[PDB]
Structure 1
């Protein structure tokens, strides 16, 4: 899986969560999102292609996924406790971090 594949996993599983009817369904999608986020974190995006791998921009790109995973982990906490509505609200917090990374790096 390359960066664009991971991004499709992220987008698709956001829909699953929004449509979910129980917290286990939210947990399964969040689990897939966690794996796609850590895979994506290893990639170099086209826009940063001609910068150093140790560049500040690349570290800021990679840290964006750390914060996304932190939010995914926080929602997994709620999902694993049967709190489907609260886990769905927690997953809604991801959207702004999707947007903020894209603004700078997509």
Structure 2
């Protein structure tokens, strides 16, 4: 339930989505990723521990998860429609946003 746990949940469930057989597994994984992203959003990452909680870095860190959740919600709509392959493709759009936050704050 710490930041590192949230990241492990995000990473593990993206791989679940990639390997998924049906829409139910994609939806279940995305729902777990959604919770993890909103939990992570409340953390102070180690790199930013000396910054102000109101700093632009901390607000950029938090905003990154808002957009991640937006992408998760798009993939969730497709998974709820039974479109496994398009839900999976929508979920791959997450990866550039994982990487972008990591490049700044990992």
TM-score (norm 1): 0.99
Aligned residue pairs total 106
Distance 1:4 1:19 in 2: 23
RMSD: 0.3
> CA offset at residue 38 of structure 1?
0.2
SS where residue 7 of structure 1 aligns?
helix
Residue deviations 1:4-63 (CA, integer Å, cap 9, x gap): 000000000011000001111100000000000000000000000000000011000000
* Unaligned residue ranges in structure 1 (runs of 5+): none
Structure 2: gaps of 5 or more residues? none
- Return structure 1 stretches of 4+ with deviation > 3 angstroms: none
TM-score, with structure 2 as normaliser? 0.99
